[PDB]
Design an enzyme around this catalytic site. Structure first.
Site, PDB file in Angstrom:
ATOM      1  N   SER A 177       0.765  -1.627  -0.256  1.00 16.42           N
ATOM      2  CA  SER A 177      -0.262  -0.291  -0.033  1.00 16.42           C
ATOM      3  C   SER A 177       0.774   0.927   0.041  1.00 16.42           C
ATOM      4  O   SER A 177       2.108   1.430  -0.784  1.00 16.42           O
ATOM      5  CB  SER A 177      -0.693  -0.106   1.006  1.00 16.42           C
ATOM      6  OG  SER A 177      -1.667   1.176   1.275  1.00 16.42           O
ATOM      7  N   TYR A 193      -5.045   8.599  -5.888  1.00 11.54           N
ATOM      8  CA  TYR A 193      -3.954   7.660  -5.989  1.00 11.54           C
ATOM      9  C   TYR A 193      -4.052   7.050  -4.317  1.00 11.54           C
ATOM     10  O   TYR A 193      -3.913   6.025  -3.821  1.00 11.54           O
ATOM     11  CB  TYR A 193      -2.873   7.861  -6.351  1.00 11.54           C
ATOM     12  CG  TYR A 193      -1.681   7.447  -5.504  1.00 11.54           C
ATOM     13  CD1 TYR A 193      -1.185   6.828  -6.690  1.00 11.54           C
ATOM     14  CD2 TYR A 193      -1.134   7.402  -4.254  1.00 11.54           C
ATOM     15  CE1 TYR A 193       0.270   5.602  -6.206  1.00 11.54           C
ATOM     16  CE2 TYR A 193       0.228   6.519  -3.514  1.00 11.54           C
ATOM     17  CZ  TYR A 193       0.557   5.891  -4.498  1.00 11.54           C
ATOM     18  OH  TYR A 193       1.659   4.740  -4.337  1.00 11.54           O
ATOM     19  N   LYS A 197      -5.340   3.237  -2.896  1.00  7.53           N
ATOM     20  CA  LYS A 197      -4.403   2.474  -1.907  1.00  7.53           C
ATOM     21  C   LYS A 197      -4.503   2.206  -0.629  1.00  7.53           C
ATOM     22  O   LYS A 197      -4.546   1.339  -0.031  1.00  7.53           O
ATOM     23  CB  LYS A 197      -3.336   3.413  -1.560  1.00  7.53           C
ATOM     24  CG  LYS A 197      -2.319   3.570  -2.323  1.00  7.53           C
ATOM     25  CD  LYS A 197      -1.777   1.841  -3.118  1.00  7.53           C
ATOM     26  CE  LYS A 197      -0.517   2.280  -4.418  1.00  7.53           C
ATOM     27  NZ  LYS A 197      -0.108   1.312  -5.086  1.00  7.53           N
TER      28      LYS A 197
HETATM   29  N1  LIG Z   1       0.912  11.740  -7.075  1.00 11.49           N
HETATM   30  C1  LIG Z   1       1.421  10.931  -6.056  1.00 11.49           C
HETATM   31  O1  LIG Z   1      -0.337  10.280  -6.637  1.00 11.49           O
HETATM   32  C2  LIG Z   1       2.217  10.444  -5.331  1.00 11.49           C
HETATM   33  C3  LIG Z   1       2.336  11.730  -4.361  1.00 11.49           C
HETATM   34  C4  LIG Z   1       3.526  12.157  -4.550  1.00 11.49           C
HETATM   35  C5  LIG Z   1       4.314  10.419  -3.584  1.00 11.49           C
HETATM   36  N2  LIG Z   1       3.695   9.377  -4.277  1.00 11.49           N
HETATM   37  C6  LIG Z   1       4.498   8.158  -3.703  1.00 11.49           C
HETATM   38  O2  LIG Z   1       5.585   8.285  -3.349  1.00 11.49           O
HETATM   39  C7  LIG Z   1       5.172   6.667  -4.621  1.00 11.49           C
HETATM   40  C8  LIG Z   1       6.355   6.488  -6.090  1.00 11.49           C
HETATM   41  O3  LIG Z   1       5.309   5.977  -6.661  1.00 11.49           O
HETATM   42  P1  LIG Z   1       6.311   5.579  -8.887  1.00 11.49           P
HETATM   43  O4  LIG Z   1       6.214   5.781  -9.472  1.00 11.49           O
HETATM   44  O5  LIG Z   1       7.615   5.998  -8.093  1.00 11.49           O
HETATM   45  O6  LIG Z   1       6.107   3.627  -8.473  1.00 11.49           O
HETATM   46  P2  LIG Z   1       7.187   2.808  -8.062  1.00 11.49           P
HETATM   47  O7  LIG Z   1       6.972   2.491  -7.651  1.00 11.49           O
HETATM   48  O8  LIG Z   1       9.007   3.564  -8.433  1.00 11.49           O
HETATM   49  O9  LIG Z   1       7.331   2.406  -9.881  1.00 11.49           O
HETATM   50  C9  LIG Z   1       5.992   1.992 -10.249  1.00 11.49           C
HETATM   51  C10 LIG Z   1       5.376   0.374 -10.965  1.00 11.49           C
HETATM   52  O10 LIG Z   1       4.203  -0.134 -11.205  1.00 11.49           O
HETATM   53  C11 LIG Z   1       4.036   0.039 -12.122  1.00 11.49           C
HETATM   54  N3  LIG Z   1       2.966   0.326 -12.573  1.00 11.49           N
HETATM   55  C12 LIG Z   1       2.621   1.515 -13.268  1.00 11.49           C
HETATM   56  N4  LIG Z   1       2.276   1.552 -14.435  1.00 11.49           N
HETATM   57  C13 LIG Z   1       1.662   0.314 -14.406  1.00 11.49           C
HETATM   58  C14 LIG Z   1       1.282   0.072 -15.555  1.00 11.49           C
HETATM   59  N5  LIG Z   1      -0.025   0.525 -15.987  1.00 11.49           N
HETATM   60  N6  LIG Z   1       0.748  -1.390 -15.730  1.00 11.49           N
HETATM   61  C15 LIG Z   1       1.491  -2.169 -14.864  1.00 11.49           C
HETATM   62  N7  LIG Z   1       2.232  -1.579 -14.358  1.00 11.49           N
HETATM   63  C16 LIG Z   1       2.332  -0.588 -14.054  1.00 11.49           C
HETATM   64  C17 LIG Z   1       5.821   0.417 -13.229  1.00 11.49           C
HETATM   65  O11 LIG Z   1       5.968  -0.196 -14.033  1.00 11.49           O
HETATM   66  P3  LIG Z   1       6.915   0.393 -15.311  1.00 11.49           P
HETATM   67  O12 LIG Z   1       8.196   0.947 -14.667  1.00 11.49           O
HETATM   68  O13 LIG Z   1       6.013  -0.852 -16.574  1.00 11.49           O
HETATM   69  O14 LIG Z   1       6.379   1.473 -15.087  1.00 11.49           O
HETATM   70  C18 LIG Z   1       6.726   0.066 -11.673  1.00 11.49           C
HETATM   71  O15 LIG Z   1       7.639  -1.077 -11.636  1.00 11.49           O
HETATM   72  C19 LIG Z   1       3.817   7.394  -4.993  1.00 11.49           C
HETATM   73  O16 LIG Z   1       4.023   6.721  -5.538  1.00 11.49           O
HETATM   74  C20 LIG Z   1       3.834   7.974  -3.612  1.00 11.49           C
HETATM   75  O17 LIG Z   1       3.627   6.249  -2.548  1.00 11.49           O
HETATM   76  C21 LIG Z   1       2.746   9.690  -4.859  1.00 11.49           C
END
Ligand SMILES: NC(=O)c1ccc[n+]([C@@H]2O[C@H](COP(=O)([O-])OP(=O)(O)OC[C@H]3O[C@@H](n4cnc5c(N)ncnc54)[C@H](OP(=O)(O)O)[C@@H]3O)[C@@H](O)[C@H]2O)c1
Ligand SMILES: NC(=O)c1ccc[n+]([C@@H]2O[C@H](COP(=O)([O-])OP(=O)(O)OC[C@H]3O[C@@H](n4cnc5c(N)ncnc54)[C@H](OP(=O)(O)O)[C@@H]3O)[C@@H](O)[C@H]2O)c1
Lengths: 243, 243
Positions: A177, A193, A197
């Site tokens: 989560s 988002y 979660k």
């Molecule tokens: N705006 C927000 O919502 C937000 C803002 C600030 C902080 N944060 C916090 O920090 C976190 C970091 O996120 P991050 O992007 O760095 O996530 P990540 O965990 O580093 O990467 C996301 C994973 O999900 C997969 N994924 C994404 N899109 C997909 C799809 N359509 N189908 C299948 N798999 C998919 C990706 O694969 P690929 O590599 O193929 O893409 C990657 O392996 C945030 O999510 C949250 O917890 C969130």
């Protein structure tokens, strides 16, 4: 006959999912890595450091296309090896790598699912369109729910097909989560988002009650952005699975 | 010029939504009631007991058909009256009743949205199909998110169009969750339902932070199955809106 447990890890191309995969591999598990696209999963010392029967592949499934991806005839994937270059290939199902890896003496079976895939929002609620809400929910929630259900069904079927699997860690689901799921940290641009979660966490908690009499373990972990190291979460995952 | 506030209440045909509507009507608000179908909204002393400028109608929108319902050309509805029979009619939008009710001297405007619509699950997670998950999430979460966003946009537009609305209770969103959204009560057969309500609750909490500098109030309430009286929740809603 040797039974070799396999983990499916979604969102394993980077971040927490990648760290979890690295941990599971060092601990001797074979791994099925999920990423969003062909290009993504295409992305040596890790494989060399592994055991002889240990296998690893990656499969591309775009979780945005839920529930249609359930119906695809095949999926694009890549297999990784100790002493040869990566092999691009087609998998008929999520569990097809297990069938390809198996022979008369070695049965590869999925025993662990980690839902770690995540799609960020980065738009204010009022600016978020229907298709964007759909994308966020499909990746974060609907797709992992489907993943959880199909893996549990497979896990139940596997124990029927292979009676000696009663002698093994119990079949396990871990859903990752976010700290943004509950509490005081409410960041603008993360409404859906954060909701997605919160949904995943709650689903897993209730699922755990349905699964307890079936001897299937269901855990949820909520990492920070305050903050959490991917390596620490990976250790927590291993701890829960091996306990 | 008289400004007459209106509430939109989803899931108002029965349960908590109905109780909320009854409370808002006794307090002098005009009401736009939502139900799932033509037949449902078709379903006298209440109307007679109301004020002369007070209006009420019901509109059928099947939230299962998200996001397609956003695009419908018109919606089936029924208007209710003090001293004449109910009138079946078409509404072009959610806010069309306000335009029909308004004239040169009276401006009806939406000032309150209550998301109360709910679709129960009653199937074990592993027995729940993709289309059933889609139905549950569409009704419980995606549709109210869309409802919230379109109402906020309308509320913002209304204050621009009618400057004197700065003199009024602030525009308000209330989202009704469930005790099954968090905590120790984990009922088998409710995994996705519980998740959907956890999502709605969290969304509203984060939305509230985005909305605070815009002077729009966003509240969430979590009723019991332990248990809560629809009338008590309705009182809580009124208390939050009138505070
Ligand atoms: N705006 C927000 O919502 C937000 C803002 C600030 C902080 N944060 C916090 O920090 C976190 C970091 O996120 P991050 O992007 O760095 O996530 P990540 O965990 O580093 O990467 C996301 C994973 O999900 C997969 N994924 C994404 N899109 C997909 C799809 N359509 N189908 C299948 N798999 C998919 C990706 O694969 P690929 O590599 O193929 O893409 C990657 O392996 C945030 O999510 C949250 O917890 C969130
Ligand atoms: N299995 C579960 O998930 C579960 C189990 C046990 C207890 N509970 C607890 O007790 C609660 C009671 O639920 P209930 O059915 O009695 O709810 P309710 O609040 O009494 O009625 C649901 C409302 O939502 C509306 N709605 C339903 N489907 C819709 C659709 N497709 N589109 C638009 N609106 C729709 C209904 O309209 P119509 O009248 O048009 O249908 C109705 O006004 C449970 O939901 C839960 O909190 C839940």
């Amino acid at each position: 006959m040797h039974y070799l447990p396999v983990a499916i890890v979604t969102g394993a191309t980077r971040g927490i999912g990648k760290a979890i995969c690295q941990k599971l591999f060092q601990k001797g598990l074979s791994c099925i890595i999920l990423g969003s696209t062909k290009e993504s999963i295409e992305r040596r010392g890790q494989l060399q450091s592994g055991l002889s029967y240990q296998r690893q592949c990656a499969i591309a499934i775009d979780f945005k296309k839920w529930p249609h991806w359930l119906d695809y005839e095949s999926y694009d994937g890549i297999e990784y090896f100790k002493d040869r270059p990566p092999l691009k290939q087609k998998y008929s199902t999520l569990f097809d790598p297990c069938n390809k890896w198996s022979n008369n003496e070695r049965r590869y079976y999925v025993n662990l699912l980690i839902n770690c895939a995540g799609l960020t929002q980065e738009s204010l609620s009022v600016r978020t369109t229907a298709s964007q809400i759909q994308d966020i929910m499909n990746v974060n929630f609907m797709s992992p729910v489907t993943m959880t259900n199909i893996c549990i069904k497979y896990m139940m079927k596997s124990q029927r097909r292979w009676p000696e699997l009663s002698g093994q860690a119990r079949p396990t689901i871990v859903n990752i989560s976010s700290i943004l799921h509950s509490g005081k940290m409410k960041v603008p641009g993360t409404s859906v988002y954060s909701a997605s979660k919160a949904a995943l966490s709650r689903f897993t908690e209730v699922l755990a009650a349905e699964m307890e009499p079936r001897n299937i373990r269901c855990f949820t972990i909520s990492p920070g952005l305050g903050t959490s190291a991917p390596a620490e979460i990976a250790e927590e995952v291993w701890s829960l699975y091996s306990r």
